[PDB]
Amino acid sequence: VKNKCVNFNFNGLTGTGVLTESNKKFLPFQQFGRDIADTTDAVRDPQTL
Amino acid sequence: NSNNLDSKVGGNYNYLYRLFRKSNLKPFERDISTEIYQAGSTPCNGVEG
Amino acid sequence: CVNLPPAYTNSFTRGVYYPDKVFRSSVLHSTQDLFLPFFSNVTWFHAKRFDNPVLPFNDGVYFASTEKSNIIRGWIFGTTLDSKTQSLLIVNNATNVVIKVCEFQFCNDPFLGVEFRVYSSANNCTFEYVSKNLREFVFKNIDGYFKIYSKHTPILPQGFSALEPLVDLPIGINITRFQTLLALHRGWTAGAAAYYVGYLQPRTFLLKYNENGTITDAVDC
C-alpha cells in the first residue's frame, strides 16, 4: 500500500509512515538505508525487489 | 539430557574432551591436535613418561 | 616436491573498504576499524627473480598484485605450516576455486605449473568450497570468521578506490603466517609478478559518501 500512512513490518523491522517510489539504487549486499540520525529512510521489498 | 541414547552399560568411551592445554582458546576456535603435553621441564620426545 | 635485498614503497590513500552493509547518501561518516594507515611503508616483491617468502600476518593484511598474465594464484595461511596444526589454502587451479581447510604437509618451495606442487598430504578436512590490472585484496580474521574484501581496476597507482565485501568463512583456526602461490614457466623462467604487502591497525577514519552512495574520499585523523 502506497501514499497512505500505514503500520509496516519489513523483514522484521516495524514502523509507521508513508511509502513511496525512490530513485536510489542499492548494491546487491544492501537491504536498508539510513540518514544522518541513523533512522531508516529506504527499504528494498523482499518480493518485488 | 540424553542418558537413554549416549549411555552404555559397560561404559561408553567414544566422547572425548581436551585436558592439558598451553593457553586459553579464543572465541569460536577449534583445536584438534594430538600432541604430548609437557608439564615439567623435561624435554618430551613424543613419549608419555 | 622440488627445492629450487628488500625493497619498499609508499601507500598513499589505498586500502579503504565499506565497513557496513548499509546504504548512505551525501554524508560524512566517521568509523573506527582495522585500516591500513595512510602514507605507510609497503613491502614490494618482484619476479633470476622469485620472491615467495613466509611473511607475518599480525592483525590483517592488505595485498596488491600488478600482473598481466595471471601468475599469482592464491595463498596458504596458518601458524606452523606442517601436519601438527590446521591450515587454510586458497587457490585457483586455472579452472576452479578451492579453499579446503585441512591439516596440510606443505613443501618449502610450493608452486604451480604453466604442475600442482603445493603439499604432500591432507588428513582431516573441516571445510570445502570447491566451485594491466591491479586486483587489490584485504584479509581479516576475527572470532572464527575469515573476511575477504576485493576490488579490480585496469590501471603503485595514486588514486582512491574502496573495496567491497566478497566473502566470510567460518574456519575457526589460529593464523600467524602466510605465503604466496606463484606459477613458473616451462629449468624455469619467471614473469611480471610484482606484489605489494602491508599491515593493518586500528584507526578512526572520516569517509565521504556521495549522492549515488559511493565512497570518494577519506581522512585519517
Place of cell 596440510: C104
Are the C-beta atoms of C157 and C86 separated by less than 8 Å? no
DSSP helix, strand, coil percent of chain C (3-state; round to 5): 0, 50, 50
Q: Which of A31, A42, A20 is nearest to C25 (CA)?
A: A42
Q: How far is CA C108 from the centre of its chain?
A: 20
**Residue C22 is placed in which grid cell?**
548499509
Pairing of strands C177-184, C104-113: parallel
Hey, are the CB atoms on C143 and B35 less than 8 Å from each other?
no
Experiment type: cryo-EM
- From the list B29, B33, B35, the residue facing C172 with the nearest CB is B29
Look-up of cell digits 539430557: B1
**CB within 8 Å: C170 and B32:** no
- Name the residue in chain C with its Cα closest to that of A30: C21
Q: Which of C84, C124, C144 sits opposite B29 (nearest CB)?
A: C144
**Residues 159-178, chain C, touching A (beta carbon < 8 A):** 164-165
Q: b/e map of C40-53 (b: 16 or more CB within 10 Å)? A: bebeebebeeebbe
Phi, psi of C31, deg, nearest 5: -150, 150
Q: Kind of pairing, strands C55-56 and C40-45?
A: unpaired
Is B46 part of the contact surface with chain C (CB cutoff 8 Å)? no
Placement of cell 527499504 in the chain: A43
- Strand segments (E) across chain C: 8-11, 16-17, 27-35, 40-45, 55-56, 61-65, 72-78, 88-92, 97-98, 104-113, 117-122, 136-142, 145-151, 162-170, 177-184, 195-197, 201-209, 215-220
Name the residue among C23, C25, C212 with its Cβ closest to that of A32: C23
Give the DSSP letter of residue C115: -
Is the distance from CB of A4 to CB of A18 less than 8 angstroms?
yes
- Gap between the Cα atoms of C148 and C89, Å rounded: 14
The residue behind cell 600432541 is B35
Taking an 8 Å cut-off on Cβ atoms, the answer to whether C21 and A31 are in contact is yes
Cα–Cα distance for residue pair C13/C37, rounded to 1 Å? 8
User: Quick one: residue C69, left, alpha or beta (phi over 0 = left, psi -120 to 50 = alpha)?
Assistant: alpha
C22 touches chain A (CB under 8 A): yes
* Chain A residues closer than 8 Å to C24 by CB: 33-34
Classify the phi-psi angles of C100: left when phi > 0, otherwise alpha if psi is within -120 to 50, otherwise beta. left
Q: How many residues does chain B have?
A: 49
**Residue A41 to residue A19: CA distance in whole angstroms:** 10
Is it the case that chain A and chain C have 3 or more CB pairs lying under 8 Å apart? yes
Q: Specify whether the CB–CB gap between A40 and A12 falls below 8 A.
A: no
Q: Which of C79, C80, C83, C85 should one mutate to test binding to chain B, selecting the residue with the greatest count of B CBs within 10 A?
A: C85
Cell readout for C164 is 567491497
What single string gives the DSSP state of each residue in A8-35?
EEETTEEEEE----------TT--EEE-
Residue contact A33–C212, C-beta within 8 A? no
The length of chain C, given as a count of residues? 221
Chains that touch A (3 or more CB pairs under 8 A): C
Is C81:C89 a contact under the CB 8 Å cutoff?
no
Nearest to C141 by CA among C202, C205, C61: C61
Kindly list the structural domains of chain C, giving each domain's residue range(s) and its CATH number in brackets, ordered by start. 8-221 (2.60.120.960)
Task: Read off the DSSP letter of residue A37.
Answer: T
Put simply, the answer to whether A30 touches C25 (Cβ < 8 Å) is no
The DSSP secondary-structure symbol of C103 reads -
Listed resolution, Å: 2.8
Q: Judging by DSSP bridges, how do beta strands C88-92 and C72-78 pair with one another?
A: antiparallel
